[PDB]
Amino acid sequence: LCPFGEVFNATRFASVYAWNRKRISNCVADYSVLYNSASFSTFKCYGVSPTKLNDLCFTNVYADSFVIRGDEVRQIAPGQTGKIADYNYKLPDDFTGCVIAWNSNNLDSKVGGNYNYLYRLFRKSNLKPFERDISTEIYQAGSTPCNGVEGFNCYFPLQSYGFQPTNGVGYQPYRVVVLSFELLHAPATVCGP
Amino acid sequence: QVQLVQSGAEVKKPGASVKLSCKASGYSFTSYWVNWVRQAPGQGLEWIGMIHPSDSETRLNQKFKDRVTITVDKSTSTAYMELSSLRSEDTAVYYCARADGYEWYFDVWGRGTLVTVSSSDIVLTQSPASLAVSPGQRATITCRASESVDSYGNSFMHWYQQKPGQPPKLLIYRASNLESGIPARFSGSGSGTDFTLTINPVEANDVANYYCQQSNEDPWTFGQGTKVEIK
Ligand SMILES: *[C@@H]1O[C@H](CO)[C@@H](O)[C@H](O)[C@H]1NC(C)=O
């Protein structure tokens, strides 16, 4: 009953810098449908087991979704660093929830390159957990002011992946869903079977 | 040349099976989706499904889930589509068509296979049904969609042209982009749910049918078509 299909089977995904978040409530979730479903190359839960999830009830589940390089999936984890964790999507050190990813080369690559998926390459400080930065201000990497115009040491902060289907698997696009589980005073509406 | 060579026409009894084939050449078979799109008399263009030959990943129109199986043979660069329990409303032209991931407009079209059987989704609405224009005038066709076909800074609305005994031909992709090889008198605009195709100035060779098609959400859907004549 929980519309996980809306998230996992969306036609297109957000760029990692502008990651999407769906709030899930008032429904029944069969997480076993997700885990014992093939072709997830990553399904790692922290603080909970996938099969214990069917026994728990939560007030709210949050599903964050975005696309990254295959090489970057390991950054969607507590305690990791790199351009994605630092500038785009940061999981806290003490994350409770699940990280699910799968190869999306067929959906998100094309010959000549799919340039619609972006990531933040430059930022003055690290994001911290669950912060979302969608600004596109010119990044001033040197000491000369940029006047909002790209130039030497004056960078557009977002760079394209340019996914091509003949890329190596580490340079192929992966779709990622991050589940966060909230238990508040309000009665729990997201339960397993 | 880049082409999709389709199997010949078949005549089937009701309840029988039909397995079409679509052989590709000139490009990297495993780098593109192969779609099946039928032109049914009275119903029009409907997308059946698609398969990516790199790993045979499929995506079916739920209207067809229980009757169609799609398959590929990479060594022969051939896509197959088998539609079962054939009914008289299955009689149609069956095109195979190429599409990029993330885009899913159709830039290369097979000839088509006529199959004859003896004895929710985004709905696209074009107007006018027929338009008469003299050469040198600016012709305008309209396409309206059930919901928005915009997504992530793009409008996934595309325009095609069809002439007799000839598959559709891509003219515009993502609302306003002239497909390479198409003359500059073809023009596209719009956003959200309302889109316009413009031919200016019309030529005697622009007499054809024109269809819009959205690829914002599953399944892909076509409009019912607009005819442009000359007067
Ligand atoms: C996505 O669609 C596939 C195929 O239709 C299905 O097997 C899967 O359960 C769906 N994912 C969901 C519902 O999370």
Author numbering:
A (entry chain A): 335 to 527
B (entry chain B): 1 to 119, 134 to 245
What's the paper's own text on this?
The SARS-CoV-2 spike protein, especially the RBD region, serves as the primary target for interfering with the virus entry process. S1 comprises the receptor-binding domain (RBD) and the N terminal domain (NTD), which mediate the recognition of and binding to the human receptors, including human angiotensin-converting enzyme 2 (hACE2) and other potential co-receptors. To gain further insights into the structural basis of the blocking and neutralizing mechanism, we selected 2 potent hACE2-blocking antibodies (PR1077 and PR953), alongside 1 non-blocker PR961, for subsequent structural analysis. The structure of the antibody Fab/Spike-RBD complex was resolved by X-ray crystallography at the resolutions of 2.5, 2.1, and 2.2 Å, respectively.
